[PDB]
Amino acid sequence: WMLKLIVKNGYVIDPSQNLEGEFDILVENGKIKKIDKNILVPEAEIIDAKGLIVCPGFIDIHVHLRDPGQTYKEDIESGSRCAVAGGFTTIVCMPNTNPPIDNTTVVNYILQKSKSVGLCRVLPTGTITKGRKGKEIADFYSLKEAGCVAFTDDGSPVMDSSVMRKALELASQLGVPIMDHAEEIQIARDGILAQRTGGHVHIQHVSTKLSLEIIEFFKEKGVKITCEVNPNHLLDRLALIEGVKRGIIDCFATDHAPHQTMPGIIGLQTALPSALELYRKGIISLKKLIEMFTINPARIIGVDLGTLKLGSPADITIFDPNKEWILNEETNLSKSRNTPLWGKVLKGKVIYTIKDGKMVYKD
Ligand SMILES: [Zn+2]
């Protein structure tokens, strides 16, 4: 047993606290104890983070773990390993498993599997409708009480506006978001219903300038609408890039989508170097990049993660923004390989991931 850990010599960035600079972090018994220039205490393990960025552990709010149902493509274990290698300490799994996440048995399965794997926290979402069939609303209260943090029929958009409106009403009562998603009309419908219900809607896919302008319209009017983009897809790509620059897009989300034969691509391990390309091209600041992986996704799902506040669980990611590497058979932790980044030089690499004060990944 080791009780204390010092992360020394790193560049700490914690946007939730407007904190940034060359600081050490003292972790004691799994929680953040002190952040200061220079810390040294006896009987501590020391990580030397010189030349690295130290930030809250990343949160990935759109992952397909294919478990249950298609576990030859990915499973909770392999997806969890991809996630911590990518710097993520918390991942949110989508409910289009087989069977789908529409009852408490499936929720329990995912939570028990995740506890047995012991790498990142896996938060389940539930379906909006029973069987994702689009007709009959699921039991949100029971699903939420079992652990679901959001609801979506992901895979297939909810088509009936009356179903979406009911879901947003129930969601508003429970304080959780609905995740959704011809594109432009659906986003407008969701914003309008979010405004009328007081519900929070998260838009999972935006591909056009008009879509971004509509979202920004709703955000300016104070509607609880947020959206995401997959950094791996950024390299209407140019319109998306402007949306990121202007702050319309709240968060990066991988949409890790394992396949073995739009197209969905795997993404957990490459999210960071992809995002860092936007930083190197001057599209976003480093602080904004970290926000979009930490505090912003944390706020979208309403969890007290994505910070380095004192007393918080010590979920910490430590990365080298300039380290070149390649996603290939030597580094891939997924059961699938479906990404146009396969075999290409990436720049930016997680070096350590720490969850509850324990090193769960090391480069
Ligand atoms: Zn999806």
Side-chain angles (χ1 to χ4, degrees):
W1 63 263
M2 296 288 153
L3 226 207
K4 296 185 210 154
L5 167 62
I6 307 159
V7 177
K8 281 187 110 348
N9 300 327
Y11 192 79
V12 175
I13 308 179
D14 181 13
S16 65
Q17 290 188 288
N18 191 34
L19 174 295
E20 86 170 271
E22 288 186 339
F23 291 121
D24 303 343
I25 310 184
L26 177 60
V27 173
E28 293 198 8
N29 197 33
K31 298 189 204 158
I32 304 287
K33 182 63 170 340
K34 182 170 188 189
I35 302 185
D36 202 358
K37 293 180 94 75
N38 324 109
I39 296 173
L40 187 59
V41 306
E43 293 185 17
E45 176 169 0
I46 291 182
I47 290 181
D48 192 358
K50 192 182 171 241
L52 311 176
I53 294 160
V54 174
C55 67
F58 297 158
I59 299 159
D60 185 353
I61 65 168
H62 194 170
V63 175
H64 296 277
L65 285 176
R66 302 292 185 220
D67 188 0
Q70 296 181 333
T71 61
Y72 61 95
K73 300 178 190 197
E74 199 76 282
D75 64 15
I76 288 162
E77 193 183 9
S78 65
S80 289
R81 287 176 174 163
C82 282
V84 297
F88 295 91
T89 44
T90 296
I91 69 184
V92 182
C93 73
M94 295 296 95
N96 65 332
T97 48
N98 196 5
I101 313 175
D102 74 355
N103 66 62
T104 50
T105 293
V106 183
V107 174
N108 180 66
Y109 167 81
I110 284 162
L111 293 178
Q112 295 295 333
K113 275 262 182 187
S114 182
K115 271 175 166 214
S116 85
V117 167
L119 290 174
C120 55
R121 182 170 10 237
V122 175
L123 296 178
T125 53
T127 56
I128 285 158
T129 57
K130 295 270 93 125
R132 301 189 309 121
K133 307 298 235 302
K135 306 273 125 116
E136 186 172 12
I137 196 197
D139 186 352
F140 288 12
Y141 184 89
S142 300
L143 292 168
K144 183 173 177 268
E145 283 298 326
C148 292
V149 303
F151 300 94
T152 177
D153 270 353
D154 188 336
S156 65
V158 166
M159 287 296 83
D160 181 34
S161 293
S162 94
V163 170
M164 181 63 155
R165 167 182 231 277
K166 284 164 211 141
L168 283 159
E169 293 178 335
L170 249 192
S172 65
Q173 289 163 33
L174 299 172
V176 298
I178 297 299
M179 313 174 158
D180 197 27
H181 200 210
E183 161 182 324
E184 288 98 337
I185 292 164
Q186 187 163 5
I187 287 174
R189 173 207 60 173
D190 291 347
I192 290 163
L193 298 179
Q195 176 171 324
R196 248 243 247 66
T197 54
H200 172 193
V201 57
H202 185 254
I203 303 304
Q204 291 181 130
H205 190 278
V206 298
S207 49
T208 78
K209 179 180 166 186
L210 186 50
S211 284
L212 288 163
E213 287 164 335
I214 294 165
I215 288 155
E216 188 50 33
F217 165 79
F218 283 117
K219 291 188 152 172
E220 291 171 8
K221 306 313 206 180
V223 175
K224 290 169 155 172
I225 178 157
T226 55
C227 62
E228 65 184 51
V229 69
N230 177 2
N232 296 307
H233 265 21
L234 303 187
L235 274 237
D236 191 338
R237 202 208 86 218
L238 291 191
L240 286 173
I241 285 192
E242 190 58 26
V244 178
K245 196 158 142 198
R246 289 179 48 190
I248 298 169
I249 301 182
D250 297 88
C251 77
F252 288 126
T254 53
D255 184 21
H256 190 261
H259 290 292
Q260 297 192 333
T261 56
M262 244 155 283
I265 57 168
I266 47 171
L268 284 158
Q269 279 189 273
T270 56
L272 176 72
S274 290
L276 285 169
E277 179 92 87
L278 300 174
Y279 164 68
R280 287 187 302 264
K281 301 218 116 60
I283 301 166
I284 61 182
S285 68
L286 190 58
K287 186 189 170 154
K288 174 155 155 191
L289 177 149
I290 291 167
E291 284 167 2
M292 299 182 69
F293 277 121
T294 55
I295 191 61
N296 292 354
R299 283 166 179 164
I300 285 169
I301 58 166
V303 295
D304 204 341
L305 300 170
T307 83
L308 292 178
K309 294 180 201 193
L310 298 192
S312 298
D315 293 357
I316 304 175
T317 295
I318 306 171
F319 69 94
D320 184 350
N322 301 123
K323 177 111 190 117
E324 289 195 342
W325 63 288
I326 298 175
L327 186 73
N328 66 15
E329 67 282 342
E330 308 295 303
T331 56
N332 181 40
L333 290 164
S334 171
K335 297 178 162 193
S336 293
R337 307 172 158 203
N338 60 301
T339 169
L341 295 176
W342 187 262
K344 306 298 187 179
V345 178
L346 310 180
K347 183 172 169 170
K349 198 176 190 179
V350 177
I351 306 301
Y352 304 97
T353 310
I354 298 160
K355 201 208 170 278
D356 286 320
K358 185 193 184 155
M359 194 181 313
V360 295
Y361 177 77
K362 181 200 167 54
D363 164 87

